[PDB]
Enzyme design. Structure first.
Site, PDB file in Angstrom:
ATOM      1  CB  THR A 182      35.545 118.773  83.536  1.00  0.00           C
ATOM      2  OG1 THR A 182      36.087 120.085  83.037  1.00  0.00           O
ATOM      3  CG2 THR A 182      36.372 117.593  83.133  1.00  0.00           C
ATOM      4  CD  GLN A 183      34.163 121.784  87.422  1.00  0.00           C
ATOM      5  OE1 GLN A 183      33.028 122.348  87.769  1.00  0.00           O
ATOM      6  NE2 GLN A 183      34.534 120.938  87.865  1.00  0.00           N
TER       7      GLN A 183
END
Lengths: 238, 221, 231, 212, 229, 242, 225, 133, 242
Positions: free
Chosen positions: E1-2
């Site tokens: 995700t990040q």
């Protein structure tokens, strides 16, 4: 007391569910036979020769291992199959394993029963015979508009359900040790042909599917080709 | 996480008297690496309208497909009425401004014929400001092409000999061949002086007959 | 009847009378005929006007460059269903870049029609549909009823006095299936089939519409002077 | 960008340049910085081009709806306040806009309102908004009076735009003039700044410091 | 995700006259630690599609579950789900690109670079690329991450333009792929000695080769290097 | 599956009567005689207990509940409604008063909250009035000892000595026959026992009646609360001296 | 609550709107007379509300529904002043009130307003009097003398005693005509008159002046006849 | 057959133009007793019929008065509070589908603008000031 | 019955038929379209002579090139006119062009058909069909001059000449007998006035009948009283002469 879905009669009955059962009674004949491994058979009424042969499939597949047939209002059965597919996908996403047949039966029963608790909806006008193979073996189930479902050795519903039930009982008595897969397909074809006699003056098409360990690798496949023709010939001979 | 990127293309739109030309390079790159040598950026969207978005490849593709869908729905909802170039320009302006706070990182050029039959080129900014122009270049090589076009199309800073700079050189009609030659020369110069520019030149020409395509090779084949 | 005020009530014999009234609403509509062969599918529609000063209402709606339909009954319901089909075809073409199959559209329409026959507060649709299309499996023709029943046939007819066209299609079933090289011959067969349903009426360029789809043939509608040579 | 507008006996005079630059490079020299809101209203583009165009077209649509509903032409104050109220909702979201809403109505005569992206809305006689606003405003202040003819006002606008273009590097590719009267706007053509500079230097003995 | 935690390595692919070849190693690196081995990064879809994923492997598992769900969904009420209405590489790539772009637009991307390879139903070889930010492009040779810098220059020496595709046999393409994998194992610190390779041919079909190993390496000359002066 | 029952089920009759509330009162009247007597040092709440089956354990169900350590309640009418309302009152006594002011609510305010809850059932949509009448006995520092009666209509009234149920009229007459100004807690208990024995048809022992008292203080039960529910043995001992 | 209370009948009528009209034709009569200058509103057994500085409203029917409508109209007038920097005209306010009344006749779970409305005033920077009436159905129109209320008649009297191509150019004549028309169906003297003149000149006549008008009317009736 | 139990559609007009529920509530109040709460330091209210709804309305009025006092730092005028309560009671007589309140209110209040005043209100939502009861 | 969207045994909706019956009681509105303009005429009814005839607006402008006339419940048409104006302005804002007459008619018919079931998967806003029929006249570059009749059923028709209202039968018969494809604007106006005079029970004057036109050059205009009076004078002279 027969105007709302969730009103008890003075004797404790729900007349809307009974009327839904009456609607189911008008449907075509659909049967299911469980073998040692299962086999589903349906009769499709050829209302006119304009219909394209083998283009109105009625048996539906859930996941890769569940087979479902229904008698009654076909759109209601399709809606129920869509809901079952949604539930199976959710279970598979949550637990990574294919949903067991008893769990699928319980989900369908809960959905159908919830469709009988309020007067803003009406009960489903179909009776469903569904089955498959899981880690615990081969399972067959029958579900009614009231939401009650049971496991069966052999099940049948529709216009010619009584003759089919008699044939199923005779086959069960004559085979205390069970049936094979091809023999079950042949018996399903014969029972469909015998139960078609409630109409006679109408052509019909036979549709057969099976799902067992070996010859299908535990998956649900439609019986098509030479095997279906052999089953049809065996049914016609009897 | 950076939601944007640069793919380093160069496009050019020139409007004629009865034709339009939209050309573009076919090199797709990222950070000194060549993703592809032939990745077209100029598309025929229908109704004799040719659109090209340059910059972020994903945003450009999304804008192109959204514009094609808008054209399809306009045909559906208005009895297959042909979409004019100005109506298409306004619709694209609305599409771009619909996400002004998360803008497309692209520069858009559309080309076609106006309702009078003359060539029309419309240029758009990333957040949705558009103007009709005669010559407009976009991309990383725009600064290396526009002065050349100004000198060789508008005849700027040119005067008739023997007048000591008192009479400007008159404007002259340019055929499609002259526009093609100017575009090819400008793109060759851009390929020479820009690392991100030059693998192949694709040109779309729009006239009353329809849209036609031409391709030429550049350096780094 | 005491079981007729809503769609969520079953009759003692197990019937839905609102759905039956919706079906009867179709019988009060103009006749529309559909047929197909290995390569092409054709719809022929007879249009109606309010009076001599009014135009003839459109009866054929395009859903996609490979799929279309013809309606009989309530026009607004047909418009709603056509918009839904256009949205589904556009979604299929955008997300997967695949042309939607006619059977998938039939299933979608069946589900949407069913969802309106089981919940209180709504009503079933009041239009029947004949949907033609072409895809990777060939040419397909489907018949749609408001009850949610979708059928696949070589030929069919809906509306009023539709028995003549259906009987003609049944009699000539072995003939129009083999009409593959000549789309105009299939159109002629459809026109001759719909002519059997005319009740002291003559086909004119004002009340005849002919839609066709095919292998190398985008969904094309002929109306007005376009149908002059098919009369 | 100078985009001046002033009021006089004959109505309103609006004068703009046409230079748009990005990172010291001149992106375009044929930018239309006057937006025709309707046949009776004009607006000036300063700040963000997209915001100005989009919201002034929206204002034109709103004015069309108002005139359809009320069977009467909308006043300049009402349209200016509609635009200001619309912009004030988006404050803090990054919109940049400076506009002069100029209109000639029967009730209010000629009227000019200035509206910015910060929500300020004020009525005035002379306005100059841009990078080179100071030179044009000085020229106007030095040569303004409520007695000028139409031709004198047009020449004054051209002279102010020319001064702004000469003394500002971000202004001047051409000059666009508009004259707003009670019957709407009249367009007075596009004049090249380069030729205008030489013409003004030859006619008036100004710009002696420039060799020609 | 990040940010990716467990990451894959380069995936390489090229086109030959009758199909596509795509290869990828089997490492599950955890930064500078080679934590996981025997991780299959080539997902077969149908009998004609192969998806190669590089980057975060949790997202790889997520999208392979998505591919399984898509395959299951395509068979619903589809009598021709195995003959003519079966999934194609183009449909799968379009779905994957749509998902990746939608994830990017929500600022919650899938940290992956994906190569879709296969043979279309009409006999045309499909080979396309996608990644985060939804950037898509096609080329006769494709490579993700580190292999984009070293494998592509070698492969382009065999298939440099479109006209070179009909002139390349399967043996030459496979040898080039194996040589590229050996070079990557030479010069990539996150590479592994073992890899898998998939061949999609219009005639033969899908051939999968697992447990392949880099061999014929050169290390003898290292005996002659001593010191640094 | 949608509720679609937004309209109210209780409306005014042409004569000005609310039918549902009257029917709820009728259901209440055919209940069990429960009485409450307020004294100078406490308040006593007594009721009779029935046996649904001989095999049923009566102590598993309690007809008197502790609302707060100083406030208790009894009911006449439908038992499940009383149980649900007791749970709601227990929640309200905390979520509205104690969690804000740090003290248990006074008896009058709790009775007001319960009356509001019962009134909300007579005006909202898709509901019916509660078929119970409640007797609330409490003590607070400023108001002393208080006894209240709440009807299905949501109207509450303070009483010095009250009774509800089948024998409500006879019990009220007996209580009003002799009600002095020097009533004690034990005197109130004796009067309540006598009235309950007169009202009951027989089987008047400690396991067929349920009694509770409010008053004084019980630090032994702190672990003090003013609510004490007498055990069966103590009731039997008091009946031996009756 | 979303039941359609107002629906069409087999004869093409909406019974709820007609019953609202019946409810309107039960309260005190309200009369509005417009002359060359000024507008006079007369009310029987405060029945006149100032929506703004230049417009006044009178109602016949239900009082609290009229209060709700008055609050809505006042809020709309203030919003119009805030937005357009211009006081609302009589026609715009009448259109807003009629639109609200019509919208209440086509929404589920609600009943139509049982109020008929009379709006009187002057447009900004104008001297022409404006008088409008709105029905519960949402229909509005411009009048010179309407008498929306029902008191068992007044409309016929005002039709007889008006115009002749000569409006009551003096305010006193208009007030006298309004008082006489009210007295036509009123035996006691239960009569209130409010006069509106341009430049926001809205005044209400005291009971003493109304009594003087009534006595003068009686003397005129008993003297000439 | 979702729910056809709507109790005569409480918020509708009669063929004569009357509201049946309001009249029935008025009958109920007339069958009640003949007319003690403090809304604030200067306003008191007497109730008639359905004391529970009266208490609910009194609590709402107290909240409204305290909100006005907080907003303007002045005691609320009697007319404003009476009008607010009357509007609240009228709201149930036009929309919502619920039964109207069955309470008649008699307000006595003192403000700085009128110097002692008396009002009465009924379930119809109409409030009238009276010189004396 | 007892349902907004209940089908009749014959296959129709009760509410739509009842709305059509309501429209049948409305005032007469006529529209005639030629190759050089479309004329719309309406009849104004006043219940009392004290009403101001200029305040009756049954002809409304949708846009410069599109006008509308109404018959039936005139209060219900305000929302339809607002929606039509908003749709036209929005189309101009989104495409920098005038919306087609047929497209605007389809939008109005979608609005009318909406609120019982969404035409594009939307919800409902009103609880009954509209009670007013509309005549929409316009000019566009695609087909030319167009006249449309729009009903609450959601369907619309294109007419060469259309009359709606109380006297629709005889007016429609006269239009059938009179209309031909080579009329002029003056002839259309005279025919509209003649048919309005025939239908109206009262005598035709300029204070009870209104006319309007839509032409390409001048857009949509509404005739003043003087022009209508002179047209009535010309009609009377032609009737008395030939």
């Amino acid at each position: 007391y027969d105007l709302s879905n969730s009103v008890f009669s003075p004797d404790g009955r729900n007349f809307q569910v009974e009327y839904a059962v009456k609607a189911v009674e008008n449907g075509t004949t659909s049967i299911g036979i469980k073998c040692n491994d299962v086999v589903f058979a349906v009769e499709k009424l050829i209302t006119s020769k304009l219909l394209v042969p083998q283009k109105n499939v009625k048996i539906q597949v859930v996941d890769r291992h569940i087979g479902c047939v229904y008698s009654g209002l076909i759109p209601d059965g399709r809606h129920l199959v869509n809901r079952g597919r949604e539930e199976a996908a959710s279970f598979k996403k949550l637990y990574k394993t294919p949903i067991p047949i008893p769990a699928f039966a319980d989900r369908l029963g809960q959905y159908v029963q919830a469709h009988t608790l309020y007067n803003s909806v009406r009960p489903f006008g179909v009776s469903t015979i569904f089955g498959g193979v899981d880690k615990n073996g081969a399972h067959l189930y029958m579900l009614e508009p009231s939401g009650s479902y049971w496991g069966y050795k052999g099940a049948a519903t529709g216009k010619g359900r009584q003759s089919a039930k008699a044939e199923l009982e005779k086959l069960v008595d004559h085979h205390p040790e069970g049936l094979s897969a091809r023999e079950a397909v042949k018996q399903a074809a014969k029972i469909i042909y015998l139960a078609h006699e409630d109409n006679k003056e109408k052509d019909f098409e036979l549709e057969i599917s099976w799902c067992s360990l070996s010859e299908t690798n535990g998956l649900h496949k439609f019986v098509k080709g030479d095997l279906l023709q052999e089953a049809i010939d065996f049914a016609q001979k009897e | 996480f950076n939601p944007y990127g640069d793919n380093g293309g160069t496009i050019l739109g020139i409007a004629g008297e009865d034709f339009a030309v939209l050309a573009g390079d076919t090199r797709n790159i990222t950070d000194y690496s060549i993703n592809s040598r032939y990745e077209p950026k100029v598309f025929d969207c229908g109704d004799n309208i040719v659109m090209s978005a340059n910059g972020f490849a994903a945003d450009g593709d999304a804008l192109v497909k959204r514009f094609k869908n808008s054209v399809k729905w306009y045909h559906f909802d208005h009895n297959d009425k042909k979409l004019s170039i100005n109506s298409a320009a306004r619709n694209i302006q609305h599409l771009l401004y619909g996400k002004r706070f998360f803008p497309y990182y692209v520069h858009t050029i559309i080309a076609g014929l106006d309702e009078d039959g003359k060539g029309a080129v419309y240029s758009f900014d990333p957040v949705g400001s558009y103007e009709r122009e005669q010559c407009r270049a976009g991309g990383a090589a725009a600064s290396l092409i526009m002065p050349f076009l100004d000198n060789q199309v508008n005849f700027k800073n040119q005067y008739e000999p023997g007048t000591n700079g008192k009479v400007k050189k008159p404007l002259k009609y340019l055929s499609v061949e002259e526009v093609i030659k100017l575009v090819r020369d400008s793109f060759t110069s851009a390929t020479e002086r820009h690392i991100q520019v030059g693998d192949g030149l694709e040109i779309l020409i729009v006239t009353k007959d329809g849209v036609r395509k031409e391709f030429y090779e550049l350096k780094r084949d | 009847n005491n079981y007729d005020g809503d769609t969520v009530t079953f009759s003692p014999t197990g019937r839905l009378f609102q759905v039956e009234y919706a079906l009867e609403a179709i019988k009060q509509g103009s006749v529309t005929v559909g047929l197909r062969s290995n390569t092409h599918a054709v719809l022929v529609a007879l249009k109606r006007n309010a009076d001599e000063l009014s135009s003839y209402q459109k009866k054929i709606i395009k859903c996609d460059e490979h799929m279309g339909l013809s309606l009989a009954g309530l026009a607004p319901d047909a418009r709603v269903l056509s918009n839904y089909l256009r949205q589904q075809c556009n979604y299929s073409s955008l997300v997967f870049n695949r042309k939607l199959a006619v059977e998938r559209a039939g299933h979608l329409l069946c589900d949407k029609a069913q969802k309106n026959t089981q919940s209180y507060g709504g009503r079933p649709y009041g239009v029947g549909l004949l949907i033609i299309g072409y895809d990777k499996s060939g040419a397909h023709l489907l018949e749609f009823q408001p009850s949610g029943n979708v059928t696949e046939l070589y030929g069919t007819a809906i509306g009023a006095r539709s028995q003549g066209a259906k009987t003609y299609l049944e009699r000539t079933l072995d003939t129009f299936i083999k009409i593959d090289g000549n789309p105009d011959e299939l159109i002629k067969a459809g026109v001759e089939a719909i002519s059997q349903s005319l009740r002291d009426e003559s086909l004119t360029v004002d009340n005849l519409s002919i839609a066709i789809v095919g292998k190398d043939t985008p969904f094309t509608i002929y109306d007005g002077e376009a149908v002059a040579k098919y009369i | 960008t100078t985009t001046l507008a002033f009021r006089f006996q004959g109505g309103i005079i609006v004068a703009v340049d046409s230079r748009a630059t990005a990172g010291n490079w001149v992106a375009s020299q044929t930018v239309k910085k006057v937006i025709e809101i309707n046949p009776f209203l004009l607006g000036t583009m300063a700040g963000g081009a997209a915001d100005c165009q989009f919201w002034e077209t929206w204002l034109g649509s709103q004015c069309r709806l108002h005139e359809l509903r009320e069977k009467e032409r909308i006043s300049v104050a009402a349209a200016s306040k509609i635009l200001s109220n619309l912009v004030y909702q988006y404050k803090g979201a990054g919109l940049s806009m400076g506009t002069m809403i100029c209109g000639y109505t029967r009730k209010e005569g000629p009227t000019i309102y200035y509206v910015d992206s910060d929500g300020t809305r004020l009525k005035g006689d002379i306005f100059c908004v841009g990078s080179g606003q100071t030179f044009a405003y000085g020229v106007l202040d030095s040569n303004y009076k409520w007695d000028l003819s139409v031709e004198d006002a047009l020449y004054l606008g051209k002279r102010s735009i020319l001064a702004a273009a000469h003394r500002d590097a971000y202004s001047g590719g051409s000059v666009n003039l508009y004259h707003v009267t009670e019957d709407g706007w009249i367009y007075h053509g596009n004049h090249d700044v380069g030729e205008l500079f030489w013409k003004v230097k030859e006619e008036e003995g100004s710009f002696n410091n420039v060799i020609g | 995700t990040q940010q990716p935690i467990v990451t894959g390595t380069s995936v390489i692919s090229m086109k030959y006259d009758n199909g596509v070849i795509i290869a990828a190693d089997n490492l599950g690196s955890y930064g500078s630690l080679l934590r996981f081995n025997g991780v299959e990064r080539l997902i077969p879809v149908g009998d004609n599609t192969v998806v190669g994923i590089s980057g975060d492997i949790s997202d790889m598992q997520h999208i392979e579950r998505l591919l399984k769900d898509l395959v299951t969904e395509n068979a619903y009420d589809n009598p021709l789900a195995d003959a003519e209405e079966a999934l194609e590489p183009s449909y799968i790539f379009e779905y994957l690109a749509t998902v990746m772009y939608q994830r990017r637009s929500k600022m919650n991307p899938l940290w992956n670079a994906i190569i879709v390879a296969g043979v279309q139903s009409n006999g045309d070889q499909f080979l396309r690329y996608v990644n985060l930010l939804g950037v898509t492009y096609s080329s006769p040779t494709l490579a993700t991450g580190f292999g984009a810098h070293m494998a592509n220059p070698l492969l382009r020496k065999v298939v440099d333009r479109e006209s070179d595709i009909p002139k390349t046999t399967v043996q030459v393409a496979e040898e080039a792929i194996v040589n590229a994998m050996r070079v990557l194992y030479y010069r990539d610190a996150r590479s592994s000695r073992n890899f898998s390779l998939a061949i999609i041919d219009k005639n033969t079909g899908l051939t999968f080769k697992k447990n392949l190993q880099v061999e014929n390496m050169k290390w003898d000359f290292a005996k002659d290097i001593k010191g640094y002066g | 599956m949608t509720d679609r029952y937004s309209f109210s089920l209780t409306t005014f009759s042409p004569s000005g009567k609310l039918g549902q509330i009257d029917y709820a009162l009728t259901a209440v009247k055919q209940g069990v005689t429960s009485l409450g007597i307020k004294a100078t040092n406490g308040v006593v709440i007594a009721t009779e207990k029935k046996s649904s089956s001989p095999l049923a354990m009566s102590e598993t169900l309690s007809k008197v509940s502790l609302l707060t350590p100083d406030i208790g309640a009894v009911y006449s009418g439908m038992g499940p409604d009383y149980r649900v309302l007791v749970d709601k009152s227990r929640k309200v006594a905390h979520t509205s008063y104690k969690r804000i002011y740090g003290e248990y609510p006074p008896t009058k305010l709790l009775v007001s909250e319960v009356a509001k809850i019962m009134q909300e059932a007579t005006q909202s949509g898709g509901v019916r009035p509660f078929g119970v009448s409640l007797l609330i006995a409490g003590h607070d520092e400023f108001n002393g000892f208080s006894l209240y009666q709440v009807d299905p209509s949501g109207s509450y009234f303070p009483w010095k000595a009250t009774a509800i149920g089948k024998g409500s009229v006879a019990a009220k007459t007996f209580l009003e026959k002799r009600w002095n100004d020097e009533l004690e807690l034990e005197d109130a208990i004796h009067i309540a026992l006598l009235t309950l024995k007169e009202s009951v048809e027989g089987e008047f022992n400690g396991d067929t009646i349920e009694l509770a008292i409010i008053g004084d203080e019980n630090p032994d039960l702190l672990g003090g609360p003013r609510f004490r529910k007498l055990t069966s043995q103590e009731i039997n001992d008091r009946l031996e001296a009756l | 609550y979303d039941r359609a209370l107002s629906i069409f009948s087999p004869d093409g009528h909406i019974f709820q709107v007609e019953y609202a009209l019946e409810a309107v034709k039960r309260g005190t009569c309200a009369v509005g007379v417009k002359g060359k200058n000024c507008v006079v509103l007369g009310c029987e057994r405060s029945k006149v509300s100032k929506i703004d500085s230049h417009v006044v409203l009178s109602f016949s029917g239900l009082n609290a529904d009229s209060r709700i409508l008055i609050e809505k109209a006042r809020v709309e007038a203030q919003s119009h002043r805030l937005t357009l920097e211009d006081p609302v005209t009589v026609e715009y306010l009448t259109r807003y009130v009629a639109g609200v009344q019509q919208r209440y006749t086509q929404s589920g779970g609600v009943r139509p307003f049982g109020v008929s409305t009379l709006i009187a005033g002057f447009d900004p920077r104008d001297d022409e009097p404006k008088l409008y009436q709105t029905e519960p159905s949402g229909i509005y129109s411009s009048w010179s003398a309407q008498t929306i209320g029902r008191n068992s008649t007044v409309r016929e009297f005002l039709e007889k005693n008006y115009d002749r191509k000569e409006p009551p150019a003096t305010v006193e004549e208009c007030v006298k005509l309004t008082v006489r028309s009210l007295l036509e169906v009123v035996q006691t003297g239960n009569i209130e008159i409010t006069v509106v003149k341009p430049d926001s000149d809205i005044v209400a006549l005291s009971s003493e002046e109304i009594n003087q008008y009534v006595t003068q009317i009686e003397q005129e009736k008993q003297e000439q006849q | 057959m979702g729910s056809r139990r709507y109790d005569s559609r409480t918020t509708i007009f009669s063929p004569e133009g009357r509201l049946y529920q309001v009249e029935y509530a008025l009958e109920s109040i007339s069958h009640a007793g003949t007319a003690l709460y403090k809304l604030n330091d200067k306003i008191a209210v007497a109730v008639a019929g359905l004391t529970a709804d009266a208490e609910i309305l009194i609590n709402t009025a107290r909240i409204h008065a305290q909100n006005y006092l907080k907003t303007y730092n002045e005691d609320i005028p009697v007319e404003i509070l009476v009008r607010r309560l009357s509007d609240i009671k009228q709201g149930y007589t036009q929309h919502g589908g619920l039964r109207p309140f069955g309470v008649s209110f008699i307000y006595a209040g003192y403000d700085d603008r009128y110097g002692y005043q008396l009002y009465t209100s009924n379930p119809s939502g109409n409030y009238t000031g009276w010189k004396a009861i | 019955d007892r349902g907004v969207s209940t089908f009749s045994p014959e296959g129709r909706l009760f509410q739509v038929e009842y709305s059509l019956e309501a429209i049948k009681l409305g005032s007469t509105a006529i529209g005639i379209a030629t190759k050089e303009g479309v004329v719309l005429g309406v009849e104004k009814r006043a219940t009392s002579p004290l009403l101001e005839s200029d305040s009756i607006e049954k002809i409304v402008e949708i846009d410069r090139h599109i006008g509308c006339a109404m018959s039936g419940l005139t209060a219900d048409a305000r929302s339809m006119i607002e929606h039509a104006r908003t749709a036209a302005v929005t189309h101009n804002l989104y495409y920098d062009e005038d919306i087609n007459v047929e497209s605007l008619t389809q939008s109005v018919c979608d609005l009318a058909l909406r609120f019982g079931e969404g035409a594009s998967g939307e919800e409902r806003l009103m609880s009954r069909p509209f009670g007013v029929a509309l005549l929409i006249a316009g000019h566009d570059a695609d087909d030319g001059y167009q006249l449309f009749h729009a009903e609450p059923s959601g369907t619309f028709y294109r007419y060469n000449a259309k009359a709606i209202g109380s006297g629709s039968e005889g007016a429609q018969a006269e239009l059938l007998n009179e209309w031909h494809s080579s009329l002029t604007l003056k002839e259309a106006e005279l025919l509209v006035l003649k048919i309005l005079k025939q239908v109206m029970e009262e005598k035709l004057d300029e204070n009870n009948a209104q006319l309007s036109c839509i032409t390409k050059q001048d857009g949509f205009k509404i005739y003043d009283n003087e022009k209508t009076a002179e047209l009535i004078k010309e009609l009377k002279e032609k009737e008395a002469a030939e």
